[PDB]
Amino acid sequence: AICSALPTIPYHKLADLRYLSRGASGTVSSARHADWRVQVAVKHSERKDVLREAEILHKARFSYILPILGICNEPEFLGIVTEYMPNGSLNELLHRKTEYPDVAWPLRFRILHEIALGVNYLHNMTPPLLHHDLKTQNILLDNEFHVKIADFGLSKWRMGTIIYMPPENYEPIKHDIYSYAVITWEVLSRKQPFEDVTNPLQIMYSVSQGHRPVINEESLPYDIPHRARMISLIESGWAQNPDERPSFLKCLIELEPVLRTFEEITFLEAVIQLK
Amino acid sequence: AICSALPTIPYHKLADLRYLSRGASGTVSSARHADWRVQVAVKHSERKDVLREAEILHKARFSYILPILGICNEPEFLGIVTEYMPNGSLNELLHRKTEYPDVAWPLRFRILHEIALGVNYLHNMTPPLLHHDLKTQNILLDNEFHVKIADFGLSKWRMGTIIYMPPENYEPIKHDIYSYAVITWEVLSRKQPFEDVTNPLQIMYSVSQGHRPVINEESLPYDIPHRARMISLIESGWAQNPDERPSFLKCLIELEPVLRTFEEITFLEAVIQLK
Ligand SMILES: CN1CCN(CCOc2cc3ncc(-c4cc(N)nc(Cl)c4)n3cc2S(=O)(=O)C(C)(C)C)CC1
Ligand SMILES: CN1CCN(CCOc2cc3ncc(-c4cc(N)nc(Cl)c4)n3cc2S(=O)(=O)C(C)(C)C)CC1
């Protein structure tokens, strides 16, 4: 059995600690490792929850899972130290229509493929790992716009936005496919799911009755490559019946041919068209 | 203490096992993970050597170190399976002058910076890890041309090309800096060190007498950005006296302002210029 212990980073090695965001999972700050001379992201009793998330990221390491660099566990400070994502989250890419006026299909399809690849790897673990928190904010993008899945605070080993939550989860495994289905809608539409509705309880009511973000020419245009394959995936994805929802392997199976259409350069052109 | 065990991959999960290259470290083939649905690279008492290299890649995980995905240890087959590097090695980028006629300075300097960043991280471990094998073939490049250091077969914990080897090791810590400057010379010159020399034993004699790849207008032109800073770095790097050679921190310190000059887009333009 080949083991590896996650490095322990002393707080004093974390210099230029500027804050980035505060969320349910914790507070994200940008630092700079004193020895490694690289920019780093830092998330910071309630200690057990952080040490669990840190264990998850170390175990669930993959090409599309946020790379944990080490842990800061001191009596004064506790925080998860990971790689810094220059181009933030997918939420920012999709909804900053001023900053990012043009976004290309190759990039949008590359992102969707990568999310499925990461979530599929998690589900192929022994025991499987279920994210249970997938949002466009959790799908991070590196300098070359590649997916890095974050927020493993709610994730569980199979042994306040509710817009990505399946309706069965409301009242007291197929959760991630539901979240993925809303994310796939959101990526293709570039629209916020249930924008019309102000009250979150209305959204919850609507979905528990079978309502889902609208599919039409205004929401998802006909110019969308493989539109029918995509809508089929989205609709089966967010099926009211959990047993009717696909596996991520089936998403991969349906996605693989769509992505073979695009030439390797069109993605690099898409990432430059952005900057 | 947060630990992680390296995954064990059954040989039957490695589909489309096609040959890529054969070297001193082993045979590098390309497969495709049957469950993860991603393309991977797999290298294959000789057992003890591979199991050691695998342990090193799992422990030495960093942004510029080749990501190990798992181990195949069966009575029939033994091999390390890692991430697949689409654009191969630095040796290929530098010497395939037909395929890559124009290679921009921002990219060349980004590569040099990243090599130093990865080797510096190795040296900053506890205990430090010394590569002891750095070659342009070992410096791998991903789809977006970012450095991934490989070949940890000769690497050691501080507790058949000889052109990157310091003269003190020929006849039976400052080794990696020596290799790095030869690499830095090679990146900037785009020429093979000791190209005019036929016999490898002659190279070994010449270097032990203080000879190093030539520095002049033919080898390294004046058009090279920060030519003086670079030559100063290279010269100190391959110093005959090991005690005279710098640390990778000093390389980083000297490199940081040179990379400061290049703007973010020029690198993305440089990578697209190749494809
Ligand atoms: C006003 N702008 C804010 C957003 N811009 C900076 C990039 O932003 C980020 C980078 C980042 N790299 C890694 C993380 C991270 C996320 C999670 N969940 N967990 C861990 Cl351990 C690490 N991360 C988070 C943000 S963040 O927190 O700012 C964002 C709001 C984009 C998620 C531009 C300016
Ligand atoms: C111009 N190109 C000619 C051919 N190219 C394809 C094969 O290129 C490769 C990719 C690769 N990805 C990961 C590895 C690897 C290396 C080591 N050391 N260890 C492990 Cl475990 C894995 N690897 C090796 C080669 S390789 O062996 O063919 C090469 C000679 C390029 C290093 C691409 C473009």
Exposed/middle/buried for residue A241 (C-beta within 10 Å: 0-12, 13-18, 19+):
exposed
Instruction: Tell if the CB–CB gap between A264 and B143 is shorter than 8 Å.
Output: yes
User: Does residue A147 contact residue A88 with C-beta atoms inside 8 Å?
Assistant: no
Residues 6+ apart with CB under 8 A from A111: A90, A139, A141, A145, A147, A187
Q: With beta carbons under 8 A apart, name residues in chain B contacting A54.
A: 2
Cβ proximity of B96 and B189 under 8 Å: no
In the block, tokens 């791998």 appear at B140
Query: How far is the C-alpha of B33 from the C-alpha of B13, rounded, in Å?
Result: 6
Pair B138, B163: CB distance under 8 Å: no
**Token pair belonging to A223:** 């110019």
Look up residue B129 and give its amino acid. L
Measured between alpha carbons, how far is B270 from B145 in angstroms, rounded to an integer? 10
How many domains, in total, are found in chain A?
Answer: 1
For tokens 């509710």, the residue is: A162
On whether the CB atoms of residues A33 and A94 are closer than 8 A, the answer is no
Pocket of ligand 2 (CB under 6 A): B 20-21, 25, 28, 41, 43, 80, 82, 84-85, 87-89, 92, 137, 140, 150-151
Going by DSSP bridges, is the β-strand pair A3-5/B3-5 parallel, antiparallel, or unpaired? antiparallel
| CB contact A127 to B (< 8 Å) | no
* Rounded distance between C-alpha atoms, residue B255 and residue B249, angstroms: 10
Ligand 2 pocket test, candidate residues B20, B68, B148, most atoms within 8 A of CB: B20
Secondary structure class of B64 (helix, strand, coil): coil
Q: Looking at chain B, which residue has its C-alpha nearest residue A265?
A: B275
Annotated ligand binding at A191? The verdict is: no
Distance from CA of A208 to the nearest CA of B (A): 33
Helices marked H in A166-218 — which ranges? 175-189, 200-208
**CB < 8 Å to B250, chain A:** none
| φ/ψ of residue B80, rounded to 5 | -85, 130
E strands, chain A, in order: 3-5, 14-22, 27-33, 39-43, 68-73, 78-83, 129-130, 139-141, 147-149, 156-157
Residues of A in contact with B124 (CB under 8 A): 35-36
Q: CB contacts < 8 Å between A and B, how many? A: 93
Phi/psi at B193 (5° precision): -60, 135
Sequence letter at residue A238: W
Read off the DSSP letter of residue B169: G
List, by residue number, the catalytic residues of B. Answer: 133
Nearest to B54 among A2, A35, A265 (CB): A2
Cis peptide bond upstream of B127, omega within 30? yes
d(CA B91, CA B102): 15
Cβ neighbours for B1, distance < 8 A, ≥ 6 positions apart: A5, A6
Q: Which of residues 76-115 of B touch A (CB under 8 A)?
A: 83
Tell me if A87 CB under 6 Å of ligand 1. Answer: no
Query: Strands (DSSP E) along chain B, which ranges?
Result: 3-5, 18-22, 27-32, 39-43, 68-73, 78-83, 129-130, 139-141, 147-149, 156-157
Cα three-residue angle B247-B251-B257, rounded to 5 degrees: 150
Cα distances (angstroms) measured from residue A112 to each of A118, A228, A258, B144, B160: 10, 16, 11, 19, 43
The answer to whether A144 faces chain B, any CB pair under 8 Å, is: yes
* List of chain A residues whose C-beta atoms are within 8 Å of the C-beta of residue B69: 62
Residue A168 and residue A243: Cα distance in Å, rounded? 12
Six token digits for residue A50: 């952080």
Rounded Cα gap, residues B153 and B68, in angstroms:
14
SS3 label, residue B3: strand
Residues 6+ apart with CB under 8 A from A261: A225, A226
Size of chain A, expressed as the number of residues it contains: 275
What lies within 8 Å, CB to CB, of B258 at 6+ separation is B109, B225, B226, B229, B230
Q: Any bridge partners for residue B147, and if so which?
A: B141
Number of residues that this document lists for chain B: 275
> What's the count of helices (H) and strands (E) in chain B, helices before strands?
8, 10
CA A90-A174-A241 angle, 5° bins? 115
Q: What phi, psi does B22 have (nearest 5°)?
A: -130, 130
3-state secondary structure of B167: helix
The position carrying tokens 């800073």 is: B229
After which residues does chain A have a break in its backbone, defined as C to next N over 2.5 Å? 44, 159, 172
Ligand nearest to the CA of B138: 2
CB B9, CB B70: distance < 8 Å? yes
CA nearest A203: which of A174, A160, A233, A173? Answer: A160
Output the six-digit token pair for B112. Answer: 């040099």
- CB distance B66 to B150 below 8 Å: yes
CA–CA separation, A75 and A77 (whole Å): 6
CB neighbour class for B149 (10 Å; exposed up to 12, middle 13-18, buried from 19)? buried
Give the separation between CA A109 and CA A105, rounded to whole angstroms.
6
- Residue for token digits 């070297």? B23
- State how far the Cα of B256 lies from the Cα of B18, in Å rounded to an integer: 40
Bridge partner list, B103: none
**Coil, helix or strand at residue A79:** strand
CA torsion sign for B49, B131, B103, B235 is negative
Q: What is the 3-state secondary structure (H, E, C) of A122-172?
A: HHCCCCCEECCCCCCCCEEECCCCCEEECCCCCCEECCCCCCCCCHHHCCC
CA A233 to CA A137: how far, in whole Å? Answer: 22
Q: Is the CB of A163 under 6 A from ligand 1?
A: no
A22 in a known ligand binding site = yes
Report which of A169, A176, A110 is spatially closest to residue A138, judged by C-alpha positions.
Answer: A176
The SS3 of residue B163 is: coil
Phi then psi dihedrals of residue B138, to 5 deg: -85, -20
Q: CATH number of the domain that B40 lies in?
A: 1.10.510.10
* The two three-digit tokens of residue B183, written as one number: 């690499």
d(CA A166, CA A240): 8
Beta bridge partners of A42: A29, A81
Q: Tokens for A211, please give them.
A: 């309502």
B132: alpha, beta or left? (left if phi > 0; alpha if psi -120 to 50): left
Neighbours of A200 (CB within 10 A): 13
Is the CB of residue B84 less than 8 Å from the CB of residue B227?
Answer: no
Distance from C-alpha of A15 to C-alpha of A124, rounded to nearest angstrom: 38
Task: Yes or no: say if B265 and A275 are a contact pair by the CB < 8 Å rule.
Answer: yes
User: What angle, rounded to 10 degrees, do the helices at A175-189 and A227-237 form?
Assistant: 140
Q: Which residue has the tokens 């817009």?
A: A163
Domain that holds residue A267: 1-275
- Give A98's contacts (C-beta < 8 A, 6+ positions apart): none
Interface test with B, best of A37, A82, A122, A260 (most B CBs within 10 A): A37
How is residue B87 written in tokens? 């654009």
Cα B246 from Cα A183, distance rounded (Å): 50
Which atom of ligand 1 is closest in space to residue A68's alpha carbon? Answer: 21
First to last CA, chain B: 45
End-to-end CA distance of chain A: 45
| CB contact at 8 A, A241 and A262 | no
Experimental method: X-ray
Q: What Rg do the C-alpha atoms of chain B give, in angstroms?
A: 19
> What type of residue is A147?
V
What is the distance between the alpha carbons of residues A213 and B254, in angstroms, rounded to a whole number?
Answer: 54
CA-to-CA distance for B55 and B129, rounded, in angstroms? 12
Q: Which two structure tokens, joined as six digits, stand for B111?
A: 């590569």
Resolution in Å, one decimal, please.
Answer: 2.9
Residue with tokens 């350069």: A265
DSSP E strands, B129-204 = 129-130, 139-141, 147-149, 156-157
Number of H helices, E strands in chain A: 8, 10
